[PDB]
Amino acid sequence: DYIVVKGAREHNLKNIDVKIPRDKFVVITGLSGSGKSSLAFDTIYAEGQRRYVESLSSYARQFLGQMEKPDVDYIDGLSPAIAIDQKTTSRNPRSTVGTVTEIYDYLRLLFARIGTPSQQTVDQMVDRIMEFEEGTRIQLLAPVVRGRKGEYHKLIEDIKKEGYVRIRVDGEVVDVNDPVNLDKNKKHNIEIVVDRLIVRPGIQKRLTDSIETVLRLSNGILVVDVIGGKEMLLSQVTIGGKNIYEVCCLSIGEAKEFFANLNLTERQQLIARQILKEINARLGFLVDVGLDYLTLARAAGTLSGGEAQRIRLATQIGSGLMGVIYILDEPSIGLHQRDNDRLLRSLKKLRDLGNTLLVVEHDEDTMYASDYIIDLGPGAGSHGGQIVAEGTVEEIKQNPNSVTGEYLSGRKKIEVPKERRKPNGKWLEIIGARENNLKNINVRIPLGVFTCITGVSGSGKSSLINEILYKRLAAELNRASVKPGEHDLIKGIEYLDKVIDIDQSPIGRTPRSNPATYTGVFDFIREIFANTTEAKTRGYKAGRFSFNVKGGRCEACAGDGINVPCEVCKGKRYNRETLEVRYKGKNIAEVLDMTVEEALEFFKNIPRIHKKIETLYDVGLGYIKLGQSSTTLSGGEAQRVKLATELSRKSTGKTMYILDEPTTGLHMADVHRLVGILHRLVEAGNSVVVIEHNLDVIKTADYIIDLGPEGGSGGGLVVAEGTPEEVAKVENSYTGQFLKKVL
Amino acid sequence: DYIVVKGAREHNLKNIDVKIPRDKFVVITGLSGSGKSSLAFDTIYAEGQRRYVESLSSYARQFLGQMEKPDVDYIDGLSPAIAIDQKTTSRNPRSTVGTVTEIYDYLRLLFARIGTPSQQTVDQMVDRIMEFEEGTRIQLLAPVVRGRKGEYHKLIEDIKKEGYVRIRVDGEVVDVNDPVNLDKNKKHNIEIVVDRLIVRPGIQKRLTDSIETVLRLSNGILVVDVIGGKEMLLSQVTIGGKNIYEVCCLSIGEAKEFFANLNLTERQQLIARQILKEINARLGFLVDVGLDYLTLARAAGTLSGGEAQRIRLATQIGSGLMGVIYILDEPSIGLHQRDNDRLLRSLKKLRDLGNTLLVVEHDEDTMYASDYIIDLGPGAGSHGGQIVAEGTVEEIKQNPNSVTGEYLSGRKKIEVPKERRKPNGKWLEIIGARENNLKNINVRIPLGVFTCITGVSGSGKSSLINEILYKRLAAELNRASVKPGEHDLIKGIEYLDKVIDIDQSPIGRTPRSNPATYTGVFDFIREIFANTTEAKTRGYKAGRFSFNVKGGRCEACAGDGINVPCEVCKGKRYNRETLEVRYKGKNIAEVLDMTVEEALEFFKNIPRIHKKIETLYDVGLGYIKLGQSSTTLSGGEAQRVKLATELSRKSTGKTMYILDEPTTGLHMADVHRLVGILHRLVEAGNSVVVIEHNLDVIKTADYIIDLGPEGGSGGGLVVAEGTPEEVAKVENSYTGQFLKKVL
DNA sequence: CATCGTACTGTTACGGCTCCATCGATGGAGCCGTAACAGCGATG
DNA sequence: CATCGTACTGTTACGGCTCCATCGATGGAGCCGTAACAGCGATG
Ligand SMILES: Nc1ncnc2c1ncn2[C@@H]1O[C@H](COP(=O)(O)OP(=O)(O)NP(=O)(O)O)[C@@H](O)[C@H]1O
Ligand SMILES: Nc1ncnc2c1ncn2[C@@H]1O[C@H](COP(=O)(O)OP(=O)(O)NP(=O)(O)O)[C@@H](O)[C@H]1O
Ligand SMILES: Nc1ncnc2c1ncn2[C@@H]1O[C@H](COP(=O)(O)OP(=O)(O)NP(=O)(O)O)[C@@H](O)[C@H]1O
Ligand SMILES: Nc1ncnc2c1ncn2[C@@H]1O[C@H](COP(=O)(O)OP(=O)(O)NP(=O)(O)O)[C@@H](O)[C@H]1O
Ligand SMILES: [Mg+2]
Ligand SMILES: [Mg+2]
Ligand SMILES: [Zn+2]
Numbered sequence A, B: 001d002y003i004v005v006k007g008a009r010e011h012n013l014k015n016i017d018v019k020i021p022r023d024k025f026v027v028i029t030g031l032s033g034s035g036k037s038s039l040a041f042d043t044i045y046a047e048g049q050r051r052y053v054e055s056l057s058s059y060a061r062q063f064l065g066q067m068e069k070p071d072v073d074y075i076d077g078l079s080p081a082i083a084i085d086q087k088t089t090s091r092n093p094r095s096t097v098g099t100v101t102e103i104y105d106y107l108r109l110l111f112a113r114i115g116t117p118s119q120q121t122v123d124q125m126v127d128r129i130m131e132f133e134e135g136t137r138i139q140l141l142a143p144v145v146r147g148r149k150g151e152y153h154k155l156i157e158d159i160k161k162e163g164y165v166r167i168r169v170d171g172e173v174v175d176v177n178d179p180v181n182l183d184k185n186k187k188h189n190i191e192i193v194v195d196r197l198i199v200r201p202g203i204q205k206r207l208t209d210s211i212e213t214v215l216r217l218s219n220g221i222l223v224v225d226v227i228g229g230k231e232m233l234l235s236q237v238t239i240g241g242k243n244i245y246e247v248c249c250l251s252i253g254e255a256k257e258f259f260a261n262l263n264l265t266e267r268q269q270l271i272a273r274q275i276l277k278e279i280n281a282r283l284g285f286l287v288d289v290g291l292d293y294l295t296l297a298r299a300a301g302t303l304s305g306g307e308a309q310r311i312r313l314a315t316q317i318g319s320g321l322m323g324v325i326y327i328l329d330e331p332s333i334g335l336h337q338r339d340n341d342r343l344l345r346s347l348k349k350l351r352d353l354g355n356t357l358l359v360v361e362h363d364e365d366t367m368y369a370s371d372y373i374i375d376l377g378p379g380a381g382s383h384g385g386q387i388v389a390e391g392t393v394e395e396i397k398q399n400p401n402s403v404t405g406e407y408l409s410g411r412k413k414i415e416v417p418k419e420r421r422k423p424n425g426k427w428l429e430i431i432g433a434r435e436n437n438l439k440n441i442n443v444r445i446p447l448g449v450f451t452c453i454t455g456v457s458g459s460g461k462s463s464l465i466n467e468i469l470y471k472r473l474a475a476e477l478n479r480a481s482v483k484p485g486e487h488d489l490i491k492g493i494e495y496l497d498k499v500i501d502i503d504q505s506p507i508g509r510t511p512r513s514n515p516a517t518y519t520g521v522f523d524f525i526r527e528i529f530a531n532t533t534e535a536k537t538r539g540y541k542a543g544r545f546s547f548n549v550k551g552g553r554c555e556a557c558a559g560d561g562i563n564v565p566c567e568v569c570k571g572k573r574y575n576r577e578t579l580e581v582r583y584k585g586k587n588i589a590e591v592l593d594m595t596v597e598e599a600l601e602f603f604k605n606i607p608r609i610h611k612k613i614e615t616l617y618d619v620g621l622g623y624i625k626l627g628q629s630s631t632t633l634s635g636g637e638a639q640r641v642k643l644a645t646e647l648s649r650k651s652t653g654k655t656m657y658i659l660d661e662p663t664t665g666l667h668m669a670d671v672h673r674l675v676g677i678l679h680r681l682v683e684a685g686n687s688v689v690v691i692e693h694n695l696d697v698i699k700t701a702d703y704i705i706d707l708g709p710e711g712g713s714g715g716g717l718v719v720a721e722g723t724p725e726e727v728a729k730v731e732n733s734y735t736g737q738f739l740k741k742v743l
Numbered sequence C, D: 001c002a003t004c005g006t007a008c009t010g011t012t013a014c015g016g017c018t019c020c021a022t023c024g025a026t027g028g029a030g031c032c033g034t035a036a037c038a039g040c041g042a043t044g
């Protein structure tokens, strides 16, 4: 009935007790960094997996592996759990859609089980001959030589001595006793005539005996000579007329149609019902989410973000179970509203089978389509990790201590601008863009305003922007050695002086990385430290103060601090001599131990450091430490670190900003902060282009370039273009339909 | 609170609903073949394992594997389950006790984690030098050449050009500027003097700088020359003074003592607490059950039945968990009463940790030491598979519908004989028996009476009987080519004419085996069928009617009948022509489809077949089919088939019967049947020797030869010898102590 | 001590069948640190 | 058209570190089927 958790203390959680209803659609909600992932994935799934694994052999435990033991007193009401991680995976080039979805294994099993390559037994042969009409004259032959050249005299003598008298050679029956002649260089088909029977009921015994002796003499080969009829031969991989490659070269929808109407007998059904059911469920889920155009032979590395996310989901939740907790960590990454609604319908269908759904989400549609909501807060980092509200959507909305309820209820909102900026005659015209699935379209992107590129997941917006416009602009301005996509020409590059791009790619997590190193400010800090008088006296350089460089780092901990915390250097990753150069009475370890807000006051005089620290504060990461390990960063925190890294660069007043879905893992407040930053950048005279699926960002855009009307080969055309109201007035545009209810 | 099972239909179960209390000692009870194993192992454990496995990846599912899906409507209250199978396992010769118990892996991890092979950092070297007293004169050296021969002129010139002036050669300090001479064929130790410091507080910076430059110049080698003191060298697997082989060559008790008082610092404890805890738990369980004499390097194939069973238990239940169902299928195989009591104490300790115990048992001590009892019956095979009684021990005893309650309450019992047979001057004297752990004892075994060999598990009774007496008797009488054990001589063999032995070994389960083939009566049946007139007319032989021979078996099913049941031959494993030779109007398939009681009436005229069928009926297997697959036979049924096979042989009135614990897997009624058969054999003038642990069998024996007083190196001596009352009068004999409460 | 009588029982080798125990590495991608390269004004 | 000014910013190649995806076989033992081998009586 309930999953009772008491005394949860993982990461930033503070002894929180929660009762999660079972067999319900439960949504975990909070600010970015509050501890939803630590509450669900790091506690509930971790404990369930640990309990299941601990009852296994040492070989199995080593092969599978278990996560770290959570700091929870006791958790009850558990069951088998299937979890989808928040982090996106990068796949090998050899990987395939069918291999990732695991339909290839089921296809291989089906082909090895029921794939038809004639193997007949004695009884089957007897029945086959019995199928003939009564009165037909037949002869049973035992071919000893089939396609060979030789004198064949000893063999004939042995056959005659065995007892057989009738032998047919070259299709003519001759007596073995009478001498015969045959060319040694000419192929001959020597066959022994065993019996000359008649077809009538009641000769089963004699026919079976003759077939048995023929099979014994000819080693499993029987030839039935039908007098006046066509001769037949009896001896001891495609399904439905399609090979494995042929069935793997079809679309998902066509494969589902083929597997839905294939003709199978009772034996084949009883043999492969389970495999057919698994394949049907997987293909049905793939068609339901919207991936009915991809072929099963497509490489998984070439898929877009939304398609990759949907295939990752289909790998785990493709075939539903019963009595299993499903933990999904933001399954709506890079998905349009339509795709999110289809996923929600699939999730409700999965829950209706008798499953518990524990979905961590930042979306509002999931919030409105949820039975129960658990709110965490009231802040992020050390200021969160405790439940601030609980109940249904309405109770959360009426709750004054929940920020997400405040944003849902309209108390806090992102204002829709009263007046939108208009283009001033400067445009970027892309002519003949035919990259990937684009259909030779001409797109004009206004300069100096806020532009949003909208469209369904897979419609061709990343390929239009990142693969063509950004690459051409980089080659023109930054002199990068990258080749752009397929296009005729781009006009209007002379109006720009720089390009800054944030891509839609995973962020690498390493123990050698932290916000300071990622943003590039640690280099300035190290140079400042190495420029002091003490470092000059001791002959130190910038690499001495790096914990990844074996010049001043502690060798006991190998620069990591933990081997169990280190004791010689106290886990600070620096030896005692390095931790003596002090800038403003503070060494490098305490500088790394500062928060962003503290570093704002400490480094308020150095402009290069101050700009980056101010950007990190602006994206809302003021609570984070400058030296926190990147492996211990959340998805939203890592995304915001990347955003600050790219947005803390110099602006000349004519630069172009390109962002590829920068909202991933961001709560509605972080979206507000990002929107404010972007609009300030635009007001400074720059131009910002955002490939976005969020309606809160979209409704504040001055220009919108919709793409579609579908994904894959069904997309690649501009379906709407103009201000958000004009796009909303378009009937056939999905983004306009969803904007009509927002504006 | 409860594990609710509804609609269980696995094997012979008939829609039984059971509520098993949780966190209790629950014992499953019934006749042999009633369906206890199918109820527990084939339903509850199977469903739990299937549910846990289905939530895993395809790779993991293939690597681990899952059992067949049970025919159960729904089962609730499940949790992770650890199960010990009833079947005994045969291990490879290379296997070891430590490897089987899985202590070897933990030992390897401990040695790889904390095993000490001097790796020092700069700070550690500085601290070590600072440990010296104040005022001491030291010199830092960088040895560039250590044990080499050469002219060494370019190296000296390079060192001088670098800046260093002081170089010590052959232990004498010389100036690099002044010319020096050295033999090219003589080894020289060239060392560069870097600094000549003093020991006082406040020289940490200079000392660290000198150590760093010395380490850089000499590539991680530092030599500290203490003036007036012993020189020391600083540079950049045994635990507790014992190697891995040394710690693996100790006894289990000594290893536990060593691991209980080993000296470890805080770092080592924080590193390997989990490994130490696992090793301590495993060794504590091994000592508790009674295996405190085996060394961890002993081969597992040389262990006795009880030791092997205890080690198999310790593999799974050695380290306890919490909230886990433990399913044990007869864990008291080949164990004395004392060992069974120790195992019961361990099981109660395991249950007190918060675990559910589901123990299938035939013993009475387990019944009396159980919180809840579930009784199945009222018979075996198709006559059982339904719950006939339920409740505590007293309720079961008062229940009139439970046979086990009847035997517990004394309503049904095995009578103790009023008068015991006395030896008639014929004895079998074994002189100088020193096989295995025997201590050169002389044992006299009376002839013509019922003799029982008793003793603790491991005391040396199987080695005394099977390895010496049976092998010598076989070599003397049956002319077998087997070498006996270590003994001087055996007297009295001239009083015997034959020997029949039932060994304590596993029974192989193959699809090609059934009771008819195992007992050897199928050969007679096949000969009878091949001797008919129809088979003579069709030229058939005895191998034609064998389903394992490719002469008359169906090739579609390959003689197995199932490929999904076969359709051409209807799964009968014979082709249509073979199923036409009828003996008394019945072919081979219906003969194989007979029960033992049916075959008693059908074959009542053929004496050779009738004797074997009558023996199979006598051991109580009248409900079984003559052709039931051996893979679908229970442990008790297989044991009884083996017993009937060996006891259905000719008796000359002077044969010797040797049985090595024939009670394994037998309920108290099957024991009564076996005791009656054995006593009839003895009354026919034969002699029976039984190595038994069952008190019901023991109390009916005319003579008893106790062995002990312990197992392993602590046993091998006769502690009692005489009638059961005389043995009961012995104070130091465990068997006498347990018999005192029975007689 | 020789002769006769309507195809005899029990126990072992040997080949074929089947079940069960026992046992990380390589390439790809992202990131950090370091080296390398390009890019107002006044007077005679 | 030449001259002067108290160690300058931003973006790319390249090597080293680290995380993550992806992928049955062999010997031993037991059993079955087949071939192989050993083992009263009366008369002259
Ligand atoms: N291993 C760790 N040790 C200590 N703190 C951690 C660790 N991992 C994460 N944190 C911090 O704990 C807080 C909560 O992290 P997490 O539970 O991942 O957040 P989240 O709610 O899933 N946020 P997001 O996914 O961005 O919406 C953040 O401040 C993290 O930086
Ligand atoms: N390298 C490639 N080769 C072939 N087809 C590709 C390749 N990359 C992408 N595609 C396809 O091109 C179409 C558009 O993908 P893309 O333009 O990258 O995505 P998008 O429209 O931005 N969608 P998303 O990022 O998920 O919201 C999809 O059908 C992709 O599968
Ligand atoms: N796979 C099977 N299919 C059909 N019947 C089976 C199968 N396995 C076992 N049986 C029969 O089902 C009955 C119960 O078997 P099982 O559940 O193993 O008994 P059990 O109570 O554990 N007996 P035992 O272990 O000897 O004390 C017996 O008559 C078996 O012969
Ligand atoms: N091949 C062997 N080499 C060395 N020791 C052995 C061997 N076989 C058995 N032992 C040991 O000899 C002792 C007696 O074993 P054994 O006589 O076979 O058992 P048992 O007394 O009949 N006990 P059990 O059958 O379990 O009730 C035990 O300590 C065994 O570990
Ligand atoms: Mg998260
Ligand atoms: Mg059983
Ligand atoms: Zn250290």
Ligand SMILES: [Zn+2]
Pocket (backbone or CB within 6 Å): B554, B555, B556, B557, B558, B561, B566, B567, B568, B569, B570, B571, B573
């Ligand atoms: Zn068949």
